[PDB]
Design a protein around this ligand. Structure first.
Ligand SMILES: Cc1cc2nc3c(=O)[nH]c(=O)nc-3n(C[C@H](O)[C@H](O)[C@H](O)COP(=O)(O)OP(=O)(O)OC[C@H]3O[C@@H](n4cnc5c(N)ncnc54)[C@H](O)[C@@H]3O)c2cc1C
Ligand SMILES: Cc1cc2nc3c(=O)[nH]c(=O)nc-3n(C[C@H](O)[C@H](O)[C@H](O)COP(=O)(O)OP(=O)(O)OC[C@H]3O[C@@H](n4cnc5c(N)ncnc54)[C@H](O)[C@@H]3O)c2cc1C
Ligand SMILES: CC(=O)Nc1ccc2c(c1)[C@@H](CC#N)C(=O)N2C
Ligand SMILES: CC(=O)Nc1ccc2c(c1)[C@@H](CC#N)C(=O)N2C
Ligand SMILES: [Zn+2]
Ligand SMILES: [Zn+2]
Lengths: 230, 230
């Protein structure tokens, strides 16, 4: 129908390749009749740092500050900072969450890493127990849409950077799977800066076109073998 | 003695296990006569976000903001924000950089991700020709000292988390090796929260003990084979 999508978007420049990919997601999902929300982290000046400012209530231990303990508890008490609960609400209502970002050091840009650290808290995204396939975000989909400086070939088994999937592990498995998401196959747009005009437009249309049938997709097996082989 | 160490420290609580580890590292390298510097990111309230505030004066293209390019030009024209250049100065001067942090989502806390995104800029950490064996910081040593919530057992090849080396790939290879560091074996203190006090003392001591002979160490071969194969 009928689906609710959250795009968590991490690029500074709306005219970027990232902004284009974000905009065609919105266009295409919107045209399908889906409900769409965008967390534009840079435009929000989203706070990436995990600090005692994230808890507004009496601390469980005010002598020695433990971020994980205090946020678990603030979540249960509903004394978390409001910028964190606003995201949680977006995540809670979403059926699909797409992360749109350029790769920074084989990972997400810090502003997005901060959204992950501060938003996916214990009690909300997972618990002990209640992680991986019993993770709290079960029944939800997640998809990483990454753009790189390096080419497709750099990111091969035997290229300098190794296989692209190697860098996907901490994000797909250690974070998304861990919270219960089914993970859809990543969308990697390699080296747009080097690509020609045509190859770039093909890359944008390929994203557009994949989204046409996104609801029909099966998740990847989010395992050590998918990521590493052998 | 005669060598300079920078410890980049990412934890909110001085009385924490990360604090204790940073403190025995200071005490021990200080005892041996080394020059020691600590960037306490939270105490500094270090800016994690990559933005146009990172370039002072006027941008070489204020129409389309491209962080990589503008930070490359700024580096060469001595026009980076001073928080960035302060950190580069400490790194330039260090013979060993130690990173001391709790594992957040199979990675570094966002605050430290920000340090790496913003400090390790093109022209400073790496450039074309210089990356991997020829990255700009060759001659230097680096070491990840990570603490985990999860046990050693969870972090094996057939455990729920996979092998530790799988999450180390983006940090050690895609970041440290990429900038031309020789990387020392990670120091991983598994699950200090659920260990006895004892075992805890054991892990602190191993770190202290290990730092006595840190200068004698062979760096790891930072290969895909090291991280992924048998
Ligand atoms: C701190 C930092 C760390 C990095 N780490 C890594 C790393 O670890 N590994 C790696 O491989 N790379 C890395 N990079 C490079 C980075 O990932 C790439 O620069 C980024 O993915 C490029 O995406 P972009 O949107 O910024 O491209 P852009 O530069 O914005 O896009 C390139 C070109 O595409 C054009 N374009 C925009 N929209 C369209 C459209 N609709 N149709 C056709 N063309 C369009 C733009 O106008 C531009 O001309 C890093 C960069 C930084 C700044
Ligand atoms: C956002 C977030 C994401 C996380 N992601 C992951 C993840 O992906 N994987 C994972 O495994 N874990 C993860 N964790 C758990 C986290 O890594 C651990 O909680 C953290 O590493 C614990 O280290 P600490 O210094 O904060 O422990 P502390 O709680 O400060 O230390 C444990 C105990 O040691 C005591 N202590 C302090 N100094 C000494 C000393 N000198 N001798 C003996 N005891 C001492 C402390 O008092 C405390 O009782 C995550 C946590 C958070 C908040
Ligand atoms: C400005 C910029 O492109 N930075 C950057 C930083 C780190 C890396 C890269 C680019 C790429 C390659 C390219 N371009 C890479 O593999 N790593 C680790
Ligand atoms: C507060 C806290 O322990 N958070 C946390 C968050 C994420 C993860 C963990 C703990 C560990 C497990 C533990 N402890 C983990 O494997 N991941 C992915
Ligand atoms: Zn998985
Ligand atoms: Zn390597």
């Amino acid at each position: 129908a009928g689906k609710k999508v959250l795009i968590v978007y991490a690029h500074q420049e709306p005219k970027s390749f990232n902004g284009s990919l974000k905009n065609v997601a919105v266009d295409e999902l919107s045209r399908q009749g889906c409900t769409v929300t965008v967390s534009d982290l840079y435009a929000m000046n989203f706070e990436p740092r995990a600090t005692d400012k994230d808890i507004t209530g009496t601390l469980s231990n005010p002598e020695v500050f433990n971020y994980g303990v205090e946020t678990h508890e603030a979540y249960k008490q509903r004394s978390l900072a409001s910028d964190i609960t606003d995201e949680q609400k977006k995540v809670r209502e979403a059926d699909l969450v797409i992360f749109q970002f350029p790769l920074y050091w084989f990972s997400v840009p810090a502003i997005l890493k901060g959204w992950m650290d501060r938003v996916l808290c214990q009690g909300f995204a997972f618990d002990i127990p209640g992680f991986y396939d019993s993770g709290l975000l079960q029944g939800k989909l997640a998809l990483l849409s990454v753009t790189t400086g390096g080419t497709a070939e750099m990111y091969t088994k035997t290229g300098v950077n190794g296989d692209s999937r190697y860098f996907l592990w901490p994000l797909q498995h250690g974070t998304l799977h861990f919270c219960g998401f089914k993970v859809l196959a990543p969308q990697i747009s390699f080296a747009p800066e080097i690509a020609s005009e045509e190859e770039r437009k093909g890359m944008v249309a390929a994203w557009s076109q994949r989204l046409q049938t996104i609801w029909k997709e099966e998740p990847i097996p989010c395992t050590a073998h998918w990521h590493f082989g052998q």
